[PDB]
Amino acid sequence: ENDRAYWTGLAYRIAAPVLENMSKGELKKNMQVEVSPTWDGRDKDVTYMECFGRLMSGIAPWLSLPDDDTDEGRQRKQLRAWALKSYAHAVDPESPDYLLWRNEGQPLVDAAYIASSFLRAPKQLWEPLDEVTKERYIAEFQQLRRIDPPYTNWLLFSAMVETFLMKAGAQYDMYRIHSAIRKIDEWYVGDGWYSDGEHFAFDYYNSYVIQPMYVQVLQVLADRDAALRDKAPGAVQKELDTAKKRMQRFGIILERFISPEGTFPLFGRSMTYRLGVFQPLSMLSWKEFLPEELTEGQVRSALTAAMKRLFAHEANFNEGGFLRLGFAGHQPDLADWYTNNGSMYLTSEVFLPLGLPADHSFWTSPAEEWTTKKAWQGDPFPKDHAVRYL
Amino acid sequence: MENDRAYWTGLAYRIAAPVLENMSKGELKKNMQVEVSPTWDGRDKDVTYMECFGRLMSGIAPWLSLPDDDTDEGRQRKQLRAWALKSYAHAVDPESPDYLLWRNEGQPLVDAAYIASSFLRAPKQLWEPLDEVTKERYIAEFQQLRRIDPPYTNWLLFSAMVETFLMKAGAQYDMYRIHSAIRKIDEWYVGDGWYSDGEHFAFDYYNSYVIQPMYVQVLQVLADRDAALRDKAPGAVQKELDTAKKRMQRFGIILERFISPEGTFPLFGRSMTYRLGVFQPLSMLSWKEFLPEELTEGQVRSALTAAMKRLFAHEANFNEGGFLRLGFAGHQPDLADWYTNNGSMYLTSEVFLPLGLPADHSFWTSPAEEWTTKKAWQGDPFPKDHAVRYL
Amino acid sequence: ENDRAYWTGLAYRIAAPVLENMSKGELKKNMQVEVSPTWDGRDKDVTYMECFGRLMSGIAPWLSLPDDDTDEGRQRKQLRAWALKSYAHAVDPESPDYLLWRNEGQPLVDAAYIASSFLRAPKQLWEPLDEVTKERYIAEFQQLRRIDPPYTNWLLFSAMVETFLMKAGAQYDMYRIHSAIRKIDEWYVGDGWYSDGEHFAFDYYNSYVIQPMYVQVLQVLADRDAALKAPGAVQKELDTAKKRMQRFGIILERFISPEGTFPLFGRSMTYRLGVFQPLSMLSWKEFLPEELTEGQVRSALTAAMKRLFAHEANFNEGGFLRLGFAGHQPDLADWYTNNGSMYLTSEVFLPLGLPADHSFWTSPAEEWTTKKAWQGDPFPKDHAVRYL
Amino acid sequence: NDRAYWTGLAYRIAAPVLENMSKGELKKNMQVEVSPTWDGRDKDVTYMECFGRLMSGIAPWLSLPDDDTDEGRQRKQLRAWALKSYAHAVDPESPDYLLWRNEGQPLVDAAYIASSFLRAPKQLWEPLDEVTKERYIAEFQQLRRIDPPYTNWLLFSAMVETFLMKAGAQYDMYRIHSAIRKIDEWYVGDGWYSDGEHFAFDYYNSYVIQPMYVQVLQVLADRDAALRDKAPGAVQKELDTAKKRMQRFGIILERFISPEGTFPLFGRSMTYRLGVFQPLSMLSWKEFLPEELTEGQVRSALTAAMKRLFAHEANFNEGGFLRLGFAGHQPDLADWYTNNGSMYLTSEVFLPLGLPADHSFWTSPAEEWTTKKAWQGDPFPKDHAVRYL
Ligand SMILES: [Cl-]
Ligand SMILES: [Cl-]
Ligand SMILES: [Cl-]
Ligand SMILES: [Cl-]
Ligand SMILES: [Cl-]
Ligand SMILES: [Cl-]
């Protein structure tokens, strides 16, 4: 009935076919796999890490909740138990579900989403892994340094992996972290927007990667008081504060993109990532730093409306229960040359505020009308203003 | 049933007629029900009338540039044009009750640029028929605006537009104002169809309200005249115009992808009270017939019509006198910025540019088509979008 | 005997053939004129405004001094008397020495140097002109708005002319001033250096034009702001511009070798001691940074001046400057260069605008940086200024 | 015979270092001096600064084939000492084991060691025994612990990894690629780069930036390294541009030399003496002087500057080591990070000794340099910006 029940129902529906199969080493065996009509010929086994890593990144906050014996609590325990077995299989070289770690550049991407999952729920998803599994993750993450990343948002993947290694107490490469955060800052364009590399692209990679991962990296550096070369006293915290303020502005923009009937603009590449476009707004919500311009109720209501409208299309799922290539249903020609149905699991990134308890104000507060909904009703709605000075 | 044009001309007439009928007889200030922002900064309220008239004429000038005919629409065009010609004369006659506020404030540079836009968009129909005394008055009023030192923002284009008009009119003009402006606008291109409104990027619709339409219009006149600009070789101005057009084509693709299946669009940035003025680039691409291959005329007409019908279904957009009110969808006065009055609202006229294509043009007669988001949310095929990174 | 006497002797030698001839409308008649071997074919009459304007810009501070009846005082009076008549001829359409105001783009350049002369000595060079002459200057300066300048240091020429018009109480174009100062600031590269337009060039146009004119324009704007309102942002801009020029001055002093030479790079190397205009301006306006003493600056500049102007071939038979650097080196002249252009070397003379009994002139000689260094003596570490 | 002056000076600088280090007595015997404003770091950094900077500058000279001339005898002696020195430098049991494992400064001087190996691989790297080679590889690799300043130091990391790549060891392409991107981004124009995000008017363009950028790109181009999102020919184009920029900087440096063999003193680290001419020396050694510069004029100008600066006996201490200063002993000129080992960057002027004694660079007639012609009142060329790079 309540918005939360819709969200947990959908998250469970997305997660369960992946995790139940992978928990017993049958993901590759059973997963109905689909590649772009313009697939560039790369090894199709990249699909499984895309699927698993992107999924776990998005549902890790949910699974970080304390255990209880409610219906939702039982689902969380089941998903988490499956996930823990899945993590073990993913790095066991003898498992049928051993992921493609050692070839291709793409694993850096999806390993960063795995790292995200551990950073978002360390006590629940990392700490319970056995020591052999932990050692395997450390080794698999470290060997990704073989990849020379594109000079784009991919720099954050390298930073995320090394940040995880740092936090896990393993040997890490600070240069990869520091070089990345410098470039991301250099790529800030203004009024909440970053360039995806040296040239500005009007697309949702600000949501898919840039702002959420930049904030996450800076948060770990700030929390550890990591000694960064030529950072004055307070400087890392100041960088984090600026990053958060920029993402707050981007969140205001994203909420104003949601139409009265729960749609949003479709532009830029990787439009098949569906509700992944809202990761910044979901992150602001989960971490409880929505700007004063946005109430929890309005954000929950707008995101729910968008989610219900998009996932009313049954053709988003195939017979096996896996996500298909598309946006609203099955639209395979929308898939870029680098896209497979594992890639689709980036849509899980909308679910971050499920990491707030069921009795948190985000979930229990009254529904509110979002900006465009008010506007087209002819009702008062707020003026918007640019944020410079960031 | 299937006549989008009739909806557009009906709305444009409804917006234009109360302004032009009153101003044609020097009674705009007498009769216009005027409204200022709740946070009005205290400037002289007479700025309202130039905002109203200038912004209106900019948007309907293409429509009124059509050849005369004796259809119902043709009769409306003749009536509007006759009123407009008398209005232009009153606007610069120092003895007219409707003499505009030319000589005080900075704001007149803004709205004079929209007047200049109207003359550049329909020179034969709106400029040439003015009597010689009126023309000389415009030239003098435009020239004295050089007293204004503009903000280092989109306002540079206002100065450029006025000077470009003066150049085209055969008057004394200041090439430095034109050239410095076009250099800055180019320097402010950020990428993938977007410019900064000055040195700092703002995510708002000023790319639509001012920057891209006026940049393209200035470059078009310079290219057409083969104007000798410092260190621009033969063909160099045309190359700048080609780039400007390509950037605006990309911005047009973005704007079409902003239109929701139910005819709404995102609301962000300042001056959201400009309503359908957000679509000026798409309307300009349509009118000047350089929509990129990604966009069909039918899909653009259909999407714009849907947005227009939905927004102007709100009766509260108009007051008792027939003038636009402060708001977006209806009367939402607190949306008005400190610099906004109900004359400012007439920038919504900038959607009407493709009315300058004849009624029997393919833009108007082609079958309706579904726009991008409408296809997408139906679960139907819709195109991949791609950044344009090379401009 | 003293350094000052060398400087005034040279300034007089440079100035007198120009001003004596032009004062009686015989500059074009008598001036032995020389153009670049690669002269681009423009009207050669540009030469006379280049000569007169660049000269007056550089000697205006000297001639701004109060009168006295010393030998130097007599030279100042004579030069000023000739200059006043010359200014009148320059804008009288019936004079044989009427300058080329109305055609070409080059007049914007040299008109800016004329404007500089009036801004640097208004009471002595502008105010005594008769009303008809003043009206003619205002009209001639205003019609230069016909020129669409290169997107380079030339923006400052337009700014300088309009700044003069503003100061003179005439109709002026603030947009020309403001757009120029914005671009110049945008073209600051760092550590005292600006780009000459959108592309950095390693040359002395920072000295010839950019920093001295940027500072002068800002100073007038700041003085007008201060005469009103709460301190404006223009004061901060002027402060930054001065600090940048202080750093550039430190760099210029470190360019002077122990034997009074300096590096030769970039275009317009025929401008000779014009390379030192920022250092001369810092000295005249008394804001040398603490790193530089007046004595060391005077000593270094004198050494450079004596060595360069020991070459007799710098002057032709008529007493006019020739194309070259140290002597007659005509192939050094760019396609836009004539011997009138050479008078930009007058810009070294700015500290002659300080009285003969000022500390700049009376303080003990001091060793300059490289002179100390190559003696094996202590000399200061240099530091980048990265915060401007 | 300009060459004999150069080899005499290079030998005088090199021999006290290499003879002592060859027998593990550099730390024992070297008369060491730190800045009056020394920041308190471990003074053992001095020895790697000394050895690495020395070897970088004389490596071209020592790359020449052996012969039976007087100079040939000196080269053989220096090279034999250097080979023993390289072995001691990485032997953890040697008294002269360098400070590899602590401080950030070792990244700097290890890059100069790597430079020496890249400049003379057959003569200085290949003859090292396999244990010594393995030790170098390990010592270079562990420098990845250092998070470099966002400055010219990025090239040190690139240089080390480039050496590792060329040596056939495990290398980090990310360190190389990120560095070359930043250096290109820091090009300001007309031959000048910024030392990091803010332009500094100083000679770090000479000490580090242009010579190391060109060297890194040259190895990448020669190997035909497949770099991320660099199309075929992209690396070659970057190398070509880098060389053209350094040609312009070389023209500028030649025009800095006064008629009496001085040059401007500006920016930090002015104690590096003739290290300011490394780009001009490199252009000469690698034979890509631009047409504006003849070998004769460059040799003559550099010789004049070198003779005038090293006429000051106080440049050397009693032990024969360089002292803190510029022209003599001027210790207050030393920055807080400077010791007398740092001074050995002045060896970077010697690169064209890597051209044989019978090469045109050495045998061509002396020519007058630009300022010398200018102040004589003689014709000299117009200079022009290169704005298109
Ligand atoms: Cl990507
Ligand atoms: Cl939706
Ligand atoms: Cl505005
Ligand atoms: Cl010039
Ligand atoms: Cl120069
Ligand atoms: Cl350094």
PDB file of N, CA and C in Angstrom, chain B residues 146 148-152 156 159 174-177 179-181 183-184 187 199 228-231, chain C residues 105 145-152 154-155 158 173-176 178-180 182-183 186 198:
ATOM      1  N   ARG B 146      23.677  53.491 -26.394  1.00  0.00           N
ATOM      2  CA  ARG B 146      25.092  53.319 -26.130  1.00  0.00           C
ATOM      3  C   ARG B 146      25.540  53.927 -24.802  1.00  0.00           C
ATOM      4  N   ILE B 148      24.338  52.956 -22.111  1.00  0.00           N
ATOM      5  CA  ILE B 148      24.226  51.852 -21.173  1.00  0.00           C
ATOM      6  C   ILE B 148      25.485  50.990 -21.253  1.00  0.00           C
ATOM      7  N   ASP B 149      26.101  50.742 -20.102  1.00  0.00           N
ATOM      8  CA  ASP B 149      27.228  49.829 -20.016  1.00  0.00           C
ATOM      9  C   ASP B 149      26.643  48.478 -19.618  1.00  0.00           C
ATOM     10  N   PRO B 150      26.505  47.502 -20.546  1.00  0.00           N
ATOM     11  CA  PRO B 150      25.778  46.280 -20.234  1.00  0.00           C
ATOM     12  C   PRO B 150      26.501  45.374 -19.238  1.00  0.00           C
ATOM     13  N   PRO B 151      25.739  44.559 -18.476  1.00  0.00           N
ATOM     14  CA  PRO B 151      26.337  43.442 -17.751  1.00  0.00           C
ATOM     15  C   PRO B 151      27.100  42.550 -18.729  1.00  0.00           C
ATOM     16  N   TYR B 152      28.099  41.856 -18.183  1.00  0.00           N
ATOM     17  CA  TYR B 152      28.950  40.954 -18.940  1.00  0.00           C
ATOM     18  C   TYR B 152      28.271  39.596 -19.035  1.00  0.00           C
ATOM     19  N   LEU B 156      25.213  41.405 -23.710  1.00  0.00           N
ATOM     20  CA  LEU B 156      26.075  41.833 -24.807  1.00  0.00           C
ATOM     21  C   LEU B 156      25.389  41.665 -26.158  1.00  0.00           C
ATOM     22  N   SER B 159      23.093  44.771 -27.239  1.00  0.00           N
ATOM     23  CA  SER B 159      23.888  45.790 -27.881  1.00  0.00           C
ATOM     24  C   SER B 159      24.245  45.395 -29.315  1.00  0.00           C
ATOM     25  N   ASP B 174      28.081  50.740 -34.606  1.00  0.00           N
ATOM     26  CA  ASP B 174      29.327  50.521 -33.892  1.00  0.00           C
ATOM     27  C   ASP B 174      29.740  49.058 -34.036  1.00  0.00           C
ATOM     28  N   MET B 175      30.678  48.801 -34.949  1.00  0.00           N
ATOM     29  CA  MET B 175      31.104  47.445 -35.239  1.00  0.00           C
ATOM     30  C   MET B 175      31.742  46.822 -33.993  1.00  0.00           C
ATOM     31  N   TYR B 176      32.423  47.642 -33.185  1.00  0.00           N
ATOM     32  CA  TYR B 176      33.072  47.112 -31.994  1.00  0.00           C
ATOM     33  C   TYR B 176      32.077  46.429 -31.055  1.00  0.00           C
ATOM     34  N   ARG B 177      30.911  47.049 -30.860  1.00  0.00           N
ATOM     35  CA  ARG B 177      29.859  46.438 -30.066  1.00  0.00           C
ATOM     36  C   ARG B 177      29.385  45.093 -30.612  1.00  0.00           C
ATOM     37  N   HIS B 179      31.226  43.059 -32.721  1.00  0.00           N
ATOM     38  CA  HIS B 179      32.307  42.096 -32.787  1.00  0.00           C
ATOM     39  C   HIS B 179      32.686  41.616 -31.379  1.00  0.00           C
ATOM     40  N   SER B 180      32.752  42.531 -30.409  1.00  0.00           N
ATOM     41  CA  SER B 180      33.093  42.131 -29.050  1.00  0.00           C
ATOM     42  C   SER B 180      32.063  41.156 -28.482  1.00  0.00           C
ATOM     43  N   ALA B 181      30.788  41.378 -28.808  1.00  0.00           N
ATOM     44  CA  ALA B 181      29.720  40.523 -28.332  1.00  0.00           C
ATOM     45  C   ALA B 181      29.825  39.121 -28.912  1.00  0.00           C
ATOM     46  N   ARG B 183      32.394  37.587 -30.134  1.00  0.00           N
ATOM     47  CA  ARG B 183      33.551  36.921 -29.551  1.00  0.00           C
ATOM     48  C   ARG B 183      33.242  36.346 -28.166  1.00  0.00           C
ATOM     49  N   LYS B 184      32.595  37.132 -27.298  1.00  0.00           N
ATOM     50  CA  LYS B 184      32.305  36.647 -25.952  1.00  0.00           C
ATOM     51  C   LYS B 184      31.317  35.483 -25.974  1.00  0.00           C
ATOM     52  N   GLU B 187      33.157  32.465 -26.849  1.00  0.00           N
ATOM     53  CA  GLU B 187      33.987  32.092 -25.708  1.00  0.00           C
ATOM     54  C   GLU B 187      33.181  31.434 -24.585  1.00  0.00           C
ATOM     55  N   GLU B 199      30.345  34.611 -17.644  1.00  0.00           N
ATOM     56  CA  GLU B 199      31.545  33.857 -17.353  1.00  0.00           C
ATOM     57  C   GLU B 199      31.236  32.598 -16.538  1.00  0.00           C
ATOM     58  N   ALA B 228      32.932  43.259 -43.284  1.00  0.00           N
ATOM     59  CA  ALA B 228      34.362  43.179 -43.037  1.00  0.00           C
ATOM     60  C   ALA B 228      34.597  43.353 -41.537  1.00  0.00           C
ATOM     61  N   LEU B 229      34.866  42.240 -40.863  1.00  0.00           N
ATOM     62  CA  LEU B 229      35.278  42.213 -39.472  1.00  0.00           C
ATOM     63  C   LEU B 229      36.796  42.036 -39.412  1.00  0.00           C
ATOM     64  N   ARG B 230      37.407  42.710 -38.435  1.00  0.00           N
ATOM     65  CA  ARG B 230      38.829  42.587 -38.164  1.00  0.00           C
ATOM     66  C   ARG B 230      39.286  41.128 -38.071  1.00  0.00           C
ATOM     67  N   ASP B 231      40.292  40.776 -38.881  1.00  0.00           N
ATOM     68  CA  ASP B 231      40.920  39.460 -38.894  1.00  0.00           C
ATOM     69  C   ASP B 231      39.948  38.311 -39.156  1.00  0.00           C
TER      70      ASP B 231
ATOM     71  N   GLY C 105      43.991  51.978 -39.658  1.00  0.00           N
ATOM     72  CA  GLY C 105      43.767  51.564 -38.280  1.00  0.00           C
ATOM     73  C   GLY C 105      44.872  52.023 -37.331  1.00  0.00           C
ATOM     74  N   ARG C 145      36.551  55.701 -33.163  1.00  0.00           N
ATOM     75  CA  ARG C 145      35.593  54.623 -32.956  1.00  0.00           C
ATOM     76  C   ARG C 145      35.198  53.897 -34.238  1.00  0.00           C
ATOM     77  N   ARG C 146      35.541  54.465 -35.402  1.00  0.00           N
ATOM     78  CA  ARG C 146      35.364  53.784 -36.676  1.00  0.00           C
ATOM     79  C   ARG C 146      36.215  52.519 -36.797  1.00  0.00           C
ATOM     80  N   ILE C 147      37.280  52.417 -35.990  1.00  0.00           N
ATOM     81  CA  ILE C 147      38.227  51.320 -36.100  1.00  0.00           C
ATOM     82  C   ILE C 147      37.739  50.115 -35.293  1.00  0.00           C
ATOM     83  N   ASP C 148      37.724  48.947 -35.932  1.00  0.00           N
ATOM     84  CA  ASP C 148      37.434  47.696 -35.235  1.00  0.00           C
ATOM     85  C   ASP C 148      38.775  47.084 -34.842  1.00  0.00           C
ATOM     86  N   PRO C 149      39.218  47.192 -33.572  1.00  0.00           N
ATOM     87  CA  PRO C 149      40.597  46.812 -33.237  1.00  0.00           C
ATOM     88  C   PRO C 149      40.835  45.306 -33.272  1.00  0.00           C
ATOM     89  N   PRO C 150      42.086  44.868 -33.526  1.00  0.00           N
ATOM     90  CA  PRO C 150      42.465  43.483 -33.266  1.00  0.00           C
ATOM     91  C   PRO C 150      42.163  43.122 -31.812  1.00  0.00           C
ATOM     92  N   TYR C 151      41.908  41.834 -31.596  1.00  0.00           N
ATOM     93  CA  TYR C 151      41.585  41.297 -30.289  1.00  0.00           C
ATOM     94  C   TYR C 151      42.870  41.013 -29.529  1.00  0.00           C
ATOM     95  N   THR C 152      43.585  42.092 -29.233  1.00  0.00           N
ATOM     96  CA  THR C 152      44.929  42.016 -28.715  1.00  0.00           C
ATOM     97  C   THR C 152      45.108  43.178 -27.747  1.00  0.00           C
ATOM     98  N   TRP C 154      45.668  45.965 -28.579  1.00  0.00           N
ATOM     99  CA  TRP C 154      45.007  47.135 -29.145  1.00  0.00           C
ATOM    100  C   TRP C 154      43.721  47.550 -28.432  1.00  0.00           C
ATOM    101  N   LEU C 155      43.065  46.615 -27.737  1.00  0.00           N
ATOM    102  CA  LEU C 155      41.887  46.998 -26.963  1.00  0.00           C
ATOM    103  C   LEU C 155      42.206  48.126 -25.978  1.00  0.00           C
ATOM    104  N   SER C 158      41.972  51.819 -27.499  1.00  0.00           N
ATOM    105  CA  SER C 158      40.613  52.295 -27.447  1.00  0.00           C
ATOM    106  C   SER C 158      40.234  52.728 -26.031  1.00  0.00           C
ATOM    107  N   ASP C 173      32.927  56.587 -24.282  1.00  0.00           N
ATOM    108  CA  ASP C 173      32.266  55.296 -24.402  1.00  0.00           C
ATOM    109  C   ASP C 173      32.793  54.341 -23.330  1.00  0.00           C
ATOM    110  N   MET C 174      32.015  54.195 -22.255  1.00  0.00           N
ATOM    111  CA  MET C 174      32.430  53.368 -21.130  1.00  0.00           C
ATOM    112  C   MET C 174      32.553  51.906 -21.568  1.00  0.00           C
ATOM    113  N   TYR C 175      31.724  51.483 -22.527  1.00  0.00           N
ATOM    114  CA  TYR C 175      31.779  50.095 -22.981  1.00  0.00           C
ATOM    115  C   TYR C 175      33.160  49.725 -23.522  1.00  0.00           C
ATOM    116  N   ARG C 176      33.759  50.621 -24.301  1.00  0.00           N
ATOM    117  CA  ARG C 176      35.114  50.423 -24.786  1.00  0.00           C
ATOM    118  C   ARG C 176      36.137  50.286 -23.666  1.00  0.00           C
ATOM    119  N   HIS C 178      35.421  49.356 -20.419  1.00  0.00           N
ATOM    120  CA  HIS C 178      35.120  48.222 -19.562  1.00  0.00           C
ATOM    121  C   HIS C 178      35.423  46.903 -20.276  1.00  0.00           C
ATOM    122  N   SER C 179      35.060  46.789 -21.558  1.00  0.00           N
ATOM    123  CA  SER C 179      35.330  45.552 -22.284  1.00  0.00           C
ATOM    124  C   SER C 179      36.834  45.286 -22.378  1.00  0.00           C
ATOM    125  N   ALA C 180      37.626  46.348 -22.558  1.00  0.00           N
ATOM    126  CA  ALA C 180      39.070  46.230 -22.640  1.00  0.00           C
ATOM    127  C   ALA C 180      39.678  45.734 -21.336  1.00  0.00           C
ATOM    128  N   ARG C 182      38.293  44.108 -18.913  1.00  0.00           N
ATOM    129  CA  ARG C 182      37.894  42.727 -18.686  1.00  0.00           C
ATOM    130  C   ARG C 182      38.782  41.768 -19.477  1.00  0.00           C
ATOM    131  N   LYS C 183      39.020  42.057 -20.764  1.00  0.00           N
ATOM    132  CA  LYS C 183      39.843  41.166 -21.565  1.00  0.00           C
ATOM    133  C   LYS C 183      41.279  41.101 -21.052  1.00  0.00           C
ATOM    134  N   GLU C 186      41.378  38.888 -18.147  1.00  0.00           N
ATOM    135  CA  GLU C 186      41.221  37.523 -18.615  1.00  0.00           C
ATOM    136  C   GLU C 186      42.493  36.969 -19.261  1.00  0.00           C
ATOM    137  N   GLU C 198      44.470  36.248 -27.179  1.00  0.00           N
ATOM    138  CA  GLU C 198      44.043  34.949 -26.687  1.00  0.00           C
ATOM    139  C   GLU C 198      45.204  33.953 -26.649  1.00  0.00           C
TER     140      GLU C 198
END
